[PDB]
Design an enzyme around this catalytic site. Structure first.
Site, PDB file in Angstrom:
ATOM      1  N   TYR K  22     -26.108  -5.146 -18.720  1.00 58.20           N
ATOM      2  CA  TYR K  22     -26.525  -4.800 -17.732  1.00 58.20           C
ATOM      3  C   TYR K  22     -26.490  -5.633 -16.383  1.00 58.20           C
ATOM      4  O   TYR K  22     -27.406  -5.756 -15.701  1.00 58.20           O
ATOM      5  CB  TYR K  22     -28.265  -5.023 -18.020  1.00 58.20           C
ATOM      6  CG  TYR K  22     -28.751  -4.393 -19.072  1.00 58.20           C
ATOM      7  CD1 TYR K  22     -29.074  -4.926 -20.178  1.00 58.20           C
ATOM      8  CD2 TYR K  22     -28.923  -2.733 -19.217  1.00 58.20           C
ATOM      9  CE1 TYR K  22     -29.780  -4.019 -21.203  1.00 58.20           C
ATOM     10  CE2 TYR K  22     -29.231  -2.105 -19.896  1.00 58.20           C
ATOM     11  CZ  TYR K  22     -29.651  -2.770 -21.291  1.00 58.20           C
ATOM     12  OH  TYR K  22     -30.399  -2.118 -22.272  1.00 58.20           O
ATOM     13  N   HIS K  99     -29.027   4.889 -14.313  1.00 53.64           N
ATOM     14  CA  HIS K  99     -28.843   3.994 -15.295  1.00 53.64           C
ATOM     15  C   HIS K  99     -27.595   3.146 -15.119  1.00 53.64           C
ATOM     16  O   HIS K  99     -26.529   3.121 -14.611  1.00 53.64           O
ATOM     17  CB  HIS K  99     -28.387   4.756 -16.730  1.00 53.64           C
ATOM     18  CG  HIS K  99     -29.652   5.563 -17.260  1.00 53.64           C
ATOM     19  ND1 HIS K  99     -30.725   5.276 -17.485  1.00 53.64           N
ATOM     20  CD2 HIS K  99     -29.678   6.989 -17.446  1.00 53.64           C
ATOM     21  CE1 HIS K  99     -31.449   6.206 -18.048  1.00 53.64           C
ATOM     22  NE2 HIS K  99     -30.797   7.315 -17.553  1.00 53.64           N
TER      23      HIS K  99
HETATM   24  O1  LIG Z   1     -30.388   1.542 -16.814  1.00 55.91           O
HETATM   25  C1  LIG Z   1     -30.042   1.606 -18.168  1.00 55.91           C
HETATM   26  O2  LIG Z   1     -28.905   1.678 -18.176  1.00 55.91           O
HETATM   27  C2  LIG Z   1     -31.013   1.551 -19.029  1.00 55.91           C
HETATM   28  C3  LIG Z   1     -30.858   2.422 -20.111  1.00 55.91           C
HETATM   29  C4  LIG Z   1     -31.723   2.587 -21.185  1.00 55.91           C
HETATM   30  O3  LIG Z   1     -31.442   3.240 -22.383  1.00 55.91           O
HETATM   31  C5  LIG Z   1     -32.680   1.352 -21.038  1.00 55.91           C
HETATM   32  C6  LIG Z   1     -33.011   0.650 -20.090  1.00 55.91           C
HETATM   33  O4  LIG Z   1     -34.226  -0.090 -19.710  1.00 55.91           O
HETATM   34  C7  LIG Z   1     -34.084  -1.208 -20.210  1.00 55.91           C
HETATM   35  C8  LIG Z   1     -33.935  -1.477 -21.620  1.00 55.91           C
HETATM   36  C9  LIG Z   1     -33.590  -2.888 -22.040  1.00 55.91           C
HETATM   37  C10 LIG Z   1     -33.530  -3.907 -21.230  1.00 55.91           C
HETATM   38  C11 LIG Z   1     -33.377  -3.521 -19.676  1.00 55.91           C
HETATM   39  N1  LIG Z   1     -33.314  -4.632 -18.806  1.00 55.91           N
HETATM   40  O5  LIG Z   1     -33.684  -4.226 -17.454  1.00 55.91           O
HETATM   41  O6  LIG Z   1     -32.622  -5.888 -19.361  1.00 55.91           O
HETATM   42  C12 LIG Z   1     -33.850  -2.340 -19.163  1.00 55.91           C
HETATM   43  C13 LIG Z   1     -32.228   1.073 -19.105  1.00 55.91           C
END
Ligand SMILES: O=C(O)c1cc(O)cc(Oc2cccc([N+](=O)[O-])c2)c1
Ligand SMILES: O=C(O)c1cc(O)cc(Oc2cccc([N+](=O)[O-])c2)c1
Ligand SMILES: O=C(O)c1cc(O)cc(Oc2cccc([N+](=O)[O-])c2)c1
Ligand SMILES: O=C(O)c1cc(O)cc(Oc2cccc([N+](=O)[O-])c2)c1
Ligand SMILES: O=C(O)c1cc(O)cc(Oc2cccc([N+](=O)[O-])c2)c1
Ligand SMILES: O=C(O)c1cc(O)cc(Oc2cccc([N+](=O)[O-])c2)c1
Ligand SMILES: O=C(O)c1cc(O)cc(Oc2cccc([N+](=O)[O-])c2)c1
Ligand SMILES: O=C(O)c1cc(O)cc(Oc2cccc([N+](=O)[O-])c2)c1
Ligand SMILES: O=C(O)c1cc(O)cc(Oc2cccc([N+](=O)[O-])c2)c1
Ligand SMILES: O=C(O)c1cc(O)cc(Oc2cccc([N+](=O)[O-])c2)c1
Ligand SMILES: O=C(O)c1cc(O)cc(Oc2cccc([N+](=O)[O-])c2)c1
Ligand SMILES: O=C(O)c1cc(O)cc(Oc2cccc([N+](=O)[O-])c2)c1
Lengths: 134, 141, 141, 141, 141, 141, 141, 141, 141, 141, 143, 141
Positions: K22, K99
């Protein structure tokens, strides 16, 4: 009273870091740290587990059962396991939900008193002191 | 070492209902059993319940920041929350999932958990004694 | 002529379990029943029980080579052994699968059987009688 | 006393070609033969056939009042009728599901049955005689 | 002012069988109950039951052609009959699907319905009172 | 030389409604259209219609005897009736399944049919002409 | 005697949207509407709306203790929330699920609810009036 | 009035392999036959065959631009190709999908098409005359 | 080097049965054949066969201990055994999964293998020669 | 005695990366490896590759005309192209489907082939040597 | 003028653990990136995060009532919330779903979303810049 | 830096077809809008279109030997083509999947893609502005 600790297929290949002989030893030492006597047996044969399980049903003794992969395939094992009138704890050393998708299903769980999974060798000891309530 | 015990939706009830399934010990009684029993292992145990998904995420984040272990019974969210799985995936200390009752002996939708694949492991079926045993485990990582 | 009645795992143990499902008669009582009945009809039943797939297969192989009819209640194996099925497919004289309980009124998974597709016929839920109705049939063909 | 034998859709067409899988016996021969054997067992058979669901139900309801047993070969409706399933559910004497062919040896769809679960037992692939054996079951209780 | 209340297969047996799921009061008294109640709301109720699918379709066609509203408990036919759905699919006036029992609290299969998607509304599990509530809706529409 | 043209449930109502989905020609108009065409092709066409599954079966049985071709629109029983399929599996002469609308462009459940696997051919989506084209096919053998 | 009407997420903006799928009726208009008809039947309606699962959960808790009835429209949680299902499982008075729209006429995902199998019954697709009919069932029991 | 007859992969080998299955007639013989039907019907038909997906799309494009009806047997691509489907959706003139053999009497994967849903209609299993019948249908539009 | 050739249930019956599915070569011939090839490449072939899951497991373990390669045919356990799979998982030397018949041409249930995922490679449907080709690979690494 | 080796999409990129799953030798080096190897067996091999399905199909046709064997590595097409399947389903000489890597140890969609049921056999996961052993099978029967 | 940027469960921990998967940017820093990027284009962005589904729903109603665009990343809820999908369906102004990671490169359950089908469009896997490109989209349309 | 813009089947018909879904800009205009926008960002962008899968595979190989970013819209190939997926897996520069329409609001089978798992990212349904945003992202690296 007596507790039967039955390990299924591939479990004699142990060595976690501990080997099976070492596991028999820690299970027994603990059992005795409680009013419990433990009988640890291991076989790679469905018919042999079947036998031990019947013997425990006639005795009416708790069973601990880590059946290996038959957990996932054996009904024969399930049916002769239902008759058990004392508690049944199902134990898996590793976390089967963090692996292939077929490990996330068990023919035993529905009929077990409870199931301990992913806590390693200590899964066995933990189960013993659930049992130590009779 | 602190340990977080977190209890999700419907655990506030207990054992006010469904003694046959869920036991009969109060949530208060349970805080008391966990705490006393943890002291006896040389751990400090913080236990909380909440029906609110948002609040459980908050505590789980807090655990992550403080790098403390977690004992988690998410109750109903166990089978529905991806959000909750994600927050828990961040934890570096052990997370144990707890079920008071034996989920595999009930409705089939309960035999599925979003959290299990990411826990250190799972206890189900062992009643209240299920926490406590999770304590013992943690007591020597 | 000669007929091999094969019983799989957890049989034996009959009459020592839920009388609500499997009746209350022993495995030794059932055999007496089977082989008395077989005489009434001018056949010689050979009745065996093993909890060993390997063993059950040996018996099947034997009935294949002597081209004798088989009445088989494979118990648990029925819902799982492709092996067991592969052995029975070789049978040159009739094969009658028999279940004591009514497998269609239980857990959904007891509703599929690897053996039925390749059997001459099947008798379910008629209790212990099922074996004796299987015998005759047979007697005719 | 009275045992009700009932056949569903296309069973009027028995014997009269289609006999690679259903045999050379006409429906009136089967009627004669079920009554021949029924008598020789102390029972009185009433054998009836219809292509009509509503007629079949009507017959089943009457058995459920007479508290008589039903031997039922519902032909194709086995695989689709909940109406037929429900009508049979109220039967207090035994119900025996019976098929002439081995349903497990054909099209996948034929392997499911709405009737089995709420019957006492099932006889499949024994041919005609499938019927005679169900009569034998009943006579012994 | 004219309302059709059409009852599908097995409903004639309402009474009479399993008081704990379908109710104590029989089919005739259901008719009688409904007609008094439709009168109260200034409606004329034409209640009718058949075990025959062809009979039901016909009643439905009459209702389409007269643009009368229709209250329907199709019975087992709910989960199975596309014809019935197709007959129903052309009512210009409202159509209300009724079931005395909670279908969702039963077998998996009872939980799918061909009728609901093309119905105005659905009332389920509210006992025999469901018919009366259906009449209320219509009175106000 | 006789061709049987057979329309199942709801085709009695052709033309009466759904102008775009089925067309404005009635069942009577169809019957006449079909007879004209037949007697320009060397054939004799008997056209019948029924909302009764029992009748449809009866007529099928009569074609199977006389060894005559069938053009069949079963309507809603196409997707649901195993009884029908079996009756049809007995015809010695060609069976041609016909549908006025394009079943593939509608609800999922309409895309499967029990008939086609055992039919010579299937004409779908071609509206009323389906019947006349099917006639032409049979004139050629 | 007191009745709990509980509306879940999105329901706070009835009428502020889509006169087509739900009514042209606002939440307060509906509350007034519910309270009034409640009085007519001799009950005490307490209508309450929240977008919050945690808050919904606690209203259900209170009602379980008070041993009162509950008319529940959970909104989308109907299809998602095991926690909601589990809180409701404990209610001793009847539970009745209400849906303004006919969910069965929409996305296949709207056609499953966790709530229904544990409810006294379900009313679907009868607009705002579905709550008033729910009150009538309870006035009656 | 120009009709376009398009044949997909493998169709150039007709007559030279199988049948029947696919008939004895060769692709060249089919070309003559469609030329004689076209004359009788008072119109034009341009037949083309290609094993290439992109060739087929190009031809389809030209037909969408020239507002010409298409008759298409797309061979293996019927079951797999979304490209061809999108290409076909564009046609304003009618599209008849033709299969020589009865795709419903073979492997389950043949029983799904990507074309039928956006086609005017489908002829299947009438062998080579399929092409002829569809040309006749177009001689109305 | 030493190669272990392991063959599970039913492989001792190499025809004997079904000549056109498994070939005319018996197990004893296969051994001799495997050994010529072994010798012709400078390897040692240990061939052994059993109808016992426990036996095969045990041979697997001692191949794992000896670090010897394994050419395996579990013959049915292939589709059912995860235990067997767990044993092969520890093989540090390469593992070749061999089937005499082409399992993809057979019932769908033969098309999944619990072993293939962890096998080095798989040879299927080249009859007895599959084993020979698998030694030839082990020779070359 | 010609044998045709046919390579599909992306196999022209062999050894141009990745390391890893496919091996270091490039498509040009394999072409020659195979030709040398067929000559030592008395076969004459024609190796061709193309990323065009039409081309492949044209190639399979010539083998069908010439009654010649074929070692096919369809690459990606294996999981997708019913057109290739039918092409191949016409080869009278042996068909060997070969894959360099072990498809069962990669993504689940790669575990299914439309080719396999119609090949004579399949070699998977023995890398470049796959082809070499298929030749060896072909130098027999 | 105004764009509503809304983040769901767990986005408060962006880049503060773990990945990689991320990026390594904090949610606060993201709030700043999006706001300066929105100003350069002559727009005003309101950026909010919440782990609370009631709070997300609340912001959405408001965006619905104000007829303002939403750029939405619902995190965990994307895969599970019908409540959220129904609230979002009311938006008549453009809704663009974002996302940071490539959901199709991950566990199967992440590859479905209740939101996509009623969204104007979706951006997946373009990291933090997913958000900026949606802002640019909004600003190349505008009348 | 050079960016490769690859458009698949049916995208040459862009702009002259349901602008409802694909909008009203032709494919040549599109070439220009992209060329222009790429210049102000300081990139050279080559744009190509083919209905031929081989031609697309080839363009991708070239991009892969070049180490150049690809902006890809495979149209229909996206949901069907594994060959295409594998050619893209090989690219070391970022790959952006682009779809003019919102695939998640059309037919269910468009909701899956063989390409998204292996692509840097996907842009969906923002119309033609999507390809530009893919350029904008690539300039940032
Ligand atoms: O933005 C995404 O790619 C995304 C996809 C998901 O399936 C879940 C999602 O929310 C999160 C899920 C886990 C972690 C974090 N984070 O901000 O470190 C965000 C974010
Ligand atoms: O205890 C388990 O986690 C477990 C789960 C299984 O699905 C199978 C199983 O048996 C074994 C499976 C592989 C190896 C070993 N071992 O003793 O190294 C044991 C063990
Ligand atoms: O701990 C469990 O076994 C468990 C499993 C679930 O699927 C849900 C769950 O939460 C509860 C659900 C209902 C009631 C109670 N309670 O406190 O009597 C707890 C608890
Ligand atoms: O014969 C049966 O009905 C039967 C069906 C099964 O699905 C399993 C089965 O094995 C047994 C399983 C448990 C007990 C006994 N027994 O006769 O004591 C047999 C037996
Ligand atoms: O009794 C059966 O095996 C049976 C099973 C079915 O699924 C359908 C069925 O009805 C018939 C179906 C086809 C033929 C005949 N017949 O009497 O020639 C009967 C009969
Ligand atoms: O009204 C119902 O609850 C209902 C639900 C069904 O799935 C089927 C149905 O038809 C009947 C099915 C069985 C019995 C009776 N009855 O009136 O005793 C009716 C009725
Ligand atoms: O089940 C079908 O898809 C179907 C296809 C048909 O061509 C006819 C059919 O029966 C009918 C189903 C609905 C209406 C009418 N009708 O002539 O008003 C007939 C049903
Ligand atoms: O009451 C319903 O029929 C309903 C069904 C659903 O699947 C969801 C649901 O929550 C809502 C979802 C969208 C809108 C509204 N509303 O009252 O304007 C309610 C309401
Ligand atoms: O027209 C068909 O029935 C047909 C159906 C298919 O699913 C595929 C198909 O392509 C062919 C597949 C194999 C052979 C021939 N041929 O004309 O020699 C054509 C043809
Ligand atoms: O289940 C299979 O797919 C399978 C495939 C094989 O190549 C062998 C096999 O085990 C056998 C199953 C039945 C018979 C024989 N036999 O040696 O005549 C072997 C089973
Ligand atoms: O030969 C295989 O193992 C194989 C299996 C597949 O599912 C696809 C496949 O085509 C290729 C897919 C990717 C790369 C290459 N290559 O020649 O480097 C070939 C090849
Ligand atoms: O750009 C898309 O979203 C898209 C998605 C698809 O599933 C297919 C697709 O290819 C086309 C399919 C039909 C038409 C056109 N066009 O350019 O008018 C393109 C394009």
């Amino acid at each position: 009273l007596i507790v039967n600790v039955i390990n299924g297929p591939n479990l004699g290949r142990l060595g976690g870091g501990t080997t099976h002989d070492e596991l028999v030893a820690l299970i027994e030492r603990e059992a005795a740290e409680l009013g419990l006597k433990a009988v640890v047996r291991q076989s790679d044969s469905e018919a042999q587990l079947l036998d031990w399980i019947h013997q425990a049903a006639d005795a009416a003794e708790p069973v601990i059962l880590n059946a290996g992969g038959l957990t996932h395939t054996s009904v024969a094992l399930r049916d002769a396991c239902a008759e058990l009138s004392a508690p049944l704890i199902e134990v898996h050393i590793s976390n089967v939900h963090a692996r292939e998708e077929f490990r996330r299903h068990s023919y035993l769980s529905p009929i077990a008193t409870g199931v301990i999974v992913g806590l390693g060798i200590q899964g066995y000891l933990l189960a013993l002191r659930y049992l130590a309530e009779h």
